[PDB]
Short mmCIF file of C-alpha atoms and ligand atoms in Angstrom, two decimals:
data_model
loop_
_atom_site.label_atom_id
_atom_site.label_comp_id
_atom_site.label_asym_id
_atom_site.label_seq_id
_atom_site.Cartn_x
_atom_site.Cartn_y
_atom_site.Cartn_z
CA UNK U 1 19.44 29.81 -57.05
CA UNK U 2 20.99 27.02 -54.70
CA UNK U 3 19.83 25.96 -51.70
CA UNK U 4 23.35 26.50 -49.63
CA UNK U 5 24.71 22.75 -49.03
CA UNK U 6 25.39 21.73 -45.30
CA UNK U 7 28.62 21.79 -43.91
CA UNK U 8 30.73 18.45 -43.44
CA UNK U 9 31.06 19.57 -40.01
CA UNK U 10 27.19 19.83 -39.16
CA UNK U 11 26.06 16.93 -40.95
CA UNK U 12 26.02 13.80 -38.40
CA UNK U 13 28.30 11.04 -38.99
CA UNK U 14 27.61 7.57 -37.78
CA UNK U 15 29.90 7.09 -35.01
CA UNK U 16 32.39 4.37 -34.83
CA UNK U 17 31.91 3.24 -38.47
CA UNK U 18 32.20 -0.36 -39.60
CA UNK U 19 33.34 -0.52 -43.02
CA UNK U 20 32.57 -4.19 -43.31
CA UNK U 21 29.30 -4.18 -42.07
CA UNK U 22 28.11 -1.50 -44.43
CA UNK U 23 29.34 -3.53 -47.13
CA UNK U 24 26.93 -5.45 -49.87
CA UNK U 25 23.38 -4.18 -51.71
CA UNK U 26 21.70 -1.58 -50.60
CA UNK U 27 18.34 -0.12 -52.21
CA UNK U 28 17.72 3.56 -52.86
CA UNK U 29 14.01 3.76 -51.34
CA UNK U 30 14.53 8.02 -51.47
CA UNK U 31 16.24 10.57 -52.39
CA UNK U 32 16.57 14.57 -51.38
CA UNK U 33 18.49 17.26 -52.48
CA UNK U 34 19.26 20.52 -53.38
CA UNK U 35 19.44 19.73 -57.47
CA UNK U 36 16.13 18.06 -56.89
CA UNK U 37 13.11 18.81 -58.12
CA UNK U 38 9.95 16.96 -57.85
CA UNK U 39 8.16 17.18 -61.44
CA UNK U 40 8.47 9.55 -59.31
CA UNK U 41 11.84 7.90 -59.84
CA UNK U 42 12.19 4.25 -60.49
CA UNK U 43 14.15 2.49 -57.12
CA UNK U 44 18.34 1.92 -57.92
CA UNK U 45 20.24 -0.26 -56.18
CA UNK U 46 24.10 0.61 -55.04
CA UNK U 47 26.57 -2.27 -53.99
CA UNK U 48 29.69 -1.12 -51.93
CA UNK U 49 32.18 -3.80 -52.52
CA UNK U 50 34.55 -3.81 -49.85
CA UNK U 51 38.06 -3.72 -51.01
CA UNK U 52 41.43 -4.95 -49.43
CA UNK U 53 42.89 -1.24 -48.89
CA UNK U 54 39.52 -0.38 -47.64
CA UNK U 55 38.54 1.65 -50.16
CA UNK U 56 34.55 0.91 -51.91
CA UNK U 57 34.40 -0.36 -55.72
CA UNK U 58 30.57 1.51 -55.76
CA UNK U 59 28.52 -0.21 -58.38
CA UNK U 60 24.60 1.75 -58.99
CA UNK U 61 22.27 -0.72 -61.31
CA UNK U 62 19.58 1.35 -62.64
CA UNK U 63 16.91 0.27 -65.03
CA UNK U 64 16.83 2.41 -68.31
CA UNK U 65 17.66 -2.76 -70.22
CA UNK U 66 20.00 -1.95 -67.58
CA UNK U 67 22.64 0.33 -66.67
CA UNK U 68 25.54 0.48 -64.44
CA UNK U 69 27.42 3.12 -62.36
CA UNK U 70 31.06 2.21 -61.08
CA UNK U 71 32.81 4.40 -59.06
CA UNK U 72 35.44 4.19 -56.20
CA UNK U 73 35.03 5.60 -53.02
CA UNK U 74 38.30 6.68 -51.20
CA UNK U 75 38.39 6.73 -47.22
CA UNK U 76 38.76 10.08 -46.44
CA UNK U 77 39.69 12.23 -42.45
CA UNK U 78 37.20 10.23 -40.70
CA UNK U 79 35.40 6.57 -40.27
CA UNK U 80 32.36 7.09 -42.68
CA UNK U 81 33.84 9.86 -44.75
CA UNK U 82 34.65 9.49 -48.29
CA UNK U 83 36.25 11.26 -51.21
CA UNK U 84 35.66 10.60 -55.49
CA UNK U 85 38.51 8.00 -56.57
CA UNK U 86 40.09 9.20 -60.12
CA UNK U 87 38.61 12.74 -59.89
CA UNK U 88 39.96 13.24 -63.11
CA UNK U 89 38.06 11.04 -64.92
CA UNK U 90 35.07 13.91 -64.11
CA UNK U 91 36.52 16.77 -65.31
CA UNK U 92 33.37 18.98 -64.04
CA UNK U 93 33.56 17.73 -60.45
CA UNK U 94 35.87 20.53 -58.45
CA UNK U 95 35.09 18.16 -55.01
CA UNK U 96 32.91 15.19 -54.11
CA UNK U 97 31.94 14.26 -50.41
CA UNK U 98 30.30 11.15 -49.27
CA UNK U 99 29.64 10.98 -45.83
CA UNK U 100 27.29 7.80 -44.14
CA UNK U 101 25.16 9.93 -41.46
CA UNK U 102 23.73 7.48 -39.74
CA UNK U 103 22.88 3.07 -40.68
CA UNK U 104 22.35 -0.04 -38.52
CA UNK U 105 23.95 -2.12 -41.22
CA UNK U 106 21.38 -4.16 -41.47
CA UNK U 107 18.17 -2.22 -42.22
CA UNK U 108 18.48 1.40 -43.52
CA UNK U 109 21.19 3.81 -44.16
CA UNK U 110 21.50 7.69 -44.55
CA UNK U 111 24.22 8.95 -46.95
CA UNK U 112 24.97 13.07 -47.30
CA UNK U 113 26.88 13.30 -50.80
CA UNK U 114 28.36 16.87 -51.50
CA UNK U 115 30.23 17.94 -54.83
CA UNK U 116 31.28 21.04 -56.33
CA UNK U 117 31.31 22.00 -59.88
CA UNK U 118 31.34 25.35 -61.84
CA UNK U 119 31.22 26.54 -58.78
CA UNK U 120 28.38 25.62 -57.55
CA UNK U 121 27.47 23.27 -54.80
CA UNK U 122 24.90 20.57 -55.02
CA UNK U 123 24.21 17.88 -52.41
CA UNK U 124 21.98 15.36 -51.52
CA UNK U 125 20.65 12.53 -49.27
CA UNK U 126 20.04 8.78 -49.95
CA UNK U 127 17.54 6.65 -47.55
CA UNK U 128 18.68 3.39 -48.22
CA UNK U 129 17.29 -0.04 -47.01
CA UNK U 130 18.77 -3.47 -47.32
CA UNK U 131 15.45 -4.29 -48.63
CA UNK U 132 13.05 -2.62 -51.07
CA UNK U 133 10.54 -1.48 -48.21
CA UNK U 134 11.28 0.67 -45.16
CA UNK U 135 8.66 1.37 -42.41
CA UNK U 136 7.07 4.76 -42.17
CA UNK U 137 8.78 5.40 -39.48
CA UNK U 138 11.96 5.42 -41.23
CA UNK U 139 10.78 6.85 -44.55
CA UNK U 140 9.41 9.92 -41.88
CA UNK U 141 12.86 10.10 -40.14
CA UNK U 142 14.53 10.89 -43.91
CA UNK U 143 11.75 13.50 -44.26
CA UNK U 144 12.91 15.63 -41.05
CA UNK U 145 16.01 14.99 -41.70
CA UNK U 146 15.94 16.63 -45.08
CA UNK U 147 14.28 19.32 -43.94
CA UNK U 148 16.45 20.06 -40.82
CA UNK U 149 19.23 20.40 -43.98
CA UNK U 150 17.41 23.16 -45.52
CA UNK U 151 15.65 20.86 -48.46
CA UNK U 152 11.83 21.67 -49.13
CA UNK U 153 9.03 19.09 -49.90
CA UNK U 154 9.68 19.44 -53.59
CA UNK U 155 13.16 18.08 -52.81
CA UNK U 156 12.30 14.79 -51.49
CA UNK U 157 11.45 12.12 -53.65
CA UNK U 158 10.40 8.32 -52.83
CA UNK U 159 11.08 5.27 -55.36
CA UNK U 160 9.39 2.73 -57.60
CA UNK U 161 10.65 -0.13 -56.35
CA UNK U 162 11.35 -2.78 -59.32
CA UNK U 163 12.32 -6.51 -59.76
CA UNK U 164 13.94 -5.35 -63.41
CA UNK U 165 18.04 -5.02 -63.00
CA UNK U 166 18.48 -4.02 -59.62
CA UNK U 167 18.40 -7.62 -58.46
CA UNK U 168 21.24 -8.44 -60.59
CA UNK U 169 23.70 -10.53 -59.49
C1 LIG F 1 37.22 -3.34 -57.94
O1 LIG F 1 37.45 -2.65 -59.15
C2 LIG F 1 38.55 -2.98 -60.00
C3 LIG F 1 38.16 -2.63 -61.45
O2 LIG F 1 38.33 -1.26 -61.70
C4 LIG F 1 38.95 -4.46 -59.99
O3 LIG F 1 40.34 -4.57 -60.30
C5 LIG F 1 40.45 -5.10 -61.63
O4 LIG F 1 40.05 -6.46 -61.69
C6 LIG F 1 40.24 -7.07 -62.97
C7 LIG F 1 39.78 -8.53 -62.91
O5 LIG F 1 40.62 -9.20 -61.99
C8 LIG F 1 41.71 -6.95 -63.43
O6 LIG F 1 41.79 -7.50 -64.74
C9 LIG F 1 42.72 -8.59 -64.85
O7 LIG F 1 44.06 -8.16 -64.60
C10 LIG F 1 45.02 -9.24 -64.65
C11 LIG F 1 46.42 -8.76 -64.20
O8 LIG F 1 46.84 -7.55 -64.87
C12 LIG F 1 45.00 -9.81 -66.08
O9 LIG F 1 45.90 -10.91 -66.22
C13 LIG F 1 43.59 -10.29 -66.42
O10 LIG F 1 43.51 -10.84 -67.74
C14 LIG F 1 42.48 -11.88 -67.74
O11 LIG F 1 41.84 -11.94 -68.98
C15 LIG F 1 42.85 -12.10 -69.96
C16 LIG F 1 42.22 -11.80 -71.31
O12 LIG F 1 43.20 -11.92 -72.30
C17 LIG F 1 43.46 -13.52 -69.87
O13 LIG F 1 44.54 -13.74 -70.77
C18 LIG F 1 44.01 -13.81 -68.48
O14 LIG F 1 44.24 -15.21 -68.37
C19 LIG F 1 43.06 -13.26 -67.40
O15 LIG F 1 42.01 -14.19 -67.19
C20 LIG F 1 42.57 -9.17 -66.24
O16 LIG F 1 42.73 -8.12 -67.22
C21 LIG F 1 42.19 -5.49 -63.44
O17 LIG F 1 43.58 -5.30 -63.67
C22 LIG F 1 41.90 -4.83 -62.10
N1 LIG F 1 42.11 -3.41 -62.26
C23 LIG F 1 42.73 -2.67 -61.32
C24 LIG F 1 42.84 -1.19 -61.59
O18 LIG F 1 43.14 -3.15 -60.27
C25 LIG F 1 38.70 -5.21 -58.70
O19 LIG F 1 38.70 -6.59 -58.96
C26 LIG F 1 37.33 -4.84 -58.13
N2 LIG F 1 37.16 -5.56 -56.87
C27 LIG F 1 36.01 -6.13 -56.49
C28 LIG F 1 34.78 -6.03 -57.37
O20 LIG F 1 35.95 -6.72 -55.41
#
């Protein structure tokens, strides 16, 4: 059923990670992955709060009013790599992965996220931008990249950007 998910190991990492530079809003402009499948989707935003022991309070605003998504994420082997805080509190989730591929900080950023559960292995890519519009060029570069992981056209989805909730605060 599943397209296989990517190992950690050929999935690029963004070298020399800065985890305060990554920090602050960042826009989901697309999406890709293996559990997706293109019947758009309205843009998200995702704010990595920097904490003291360097771990991420992760905070998604989505519009339904508005919701939001708090989560921690835990520094894991490498500069970039991340595991699920409180995996217990997600009693389906065997593993989760979260792995920045490649950002400038200040433009665009592509994350690989990987989880397990019932054993099954879903994962998928996030383009995001510091702002609600990326150039094609980018938005291209996501494209390839998806597809150099295996994901099809139908698994690559680009946003509605909004000014509802995803602005907040
Ligand atoms: C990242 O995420 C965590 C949230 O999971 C967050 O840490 C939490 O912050 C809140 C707010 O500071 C903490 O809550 C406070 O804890 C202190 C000490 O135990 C309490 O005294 C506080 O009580 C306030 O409200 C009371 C209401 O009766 C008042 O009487 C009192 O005067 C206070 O004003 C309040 O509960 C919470 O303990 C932590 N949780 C953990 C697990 O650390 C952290 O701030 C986030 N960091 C970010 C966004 O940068």
């Amino acid at each position: 059923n599943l397209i296989p998910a990517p190992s950690l190991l050929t999935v690029p990492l963004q070298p020399d990670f800065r985890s305060d530079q990554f920090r602050g809003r960042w826009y989901v402009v697309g999406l890709a992955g293996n559990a997706v499948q293109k019947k758009s989707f309205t843009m998200y935003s995702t704010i990595y709060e920097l904490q003291e022991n360097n771990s991420y309070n992760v905070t998604s605003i989505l519009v339904r009013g508005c919701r939001y998504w708090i989560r921690t994420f835990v520094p894991s082997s490498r500069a970039g790599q991340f595991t699920l805080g409180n995996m217990h509190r997600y009693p389906q989730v065997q593993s989760y992965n979260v792995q920045v591929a490649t950002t400038d900080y200040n433009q665009f950023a592509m994350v690989f996220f990987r989880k397990t559960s019932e054993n099954k292995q879903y994962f998928k890519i996030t383009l995001y931008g510091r702002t609600k519009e990326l150039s094609p060029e980018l938005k291209e570069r996501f494209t390839r990249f998806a597809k150099s992981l295996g994901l099809k056209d139908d698994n690559i989805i680009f946003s509605v950007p909004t000014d509802q909730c995803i602005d907040n605060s």
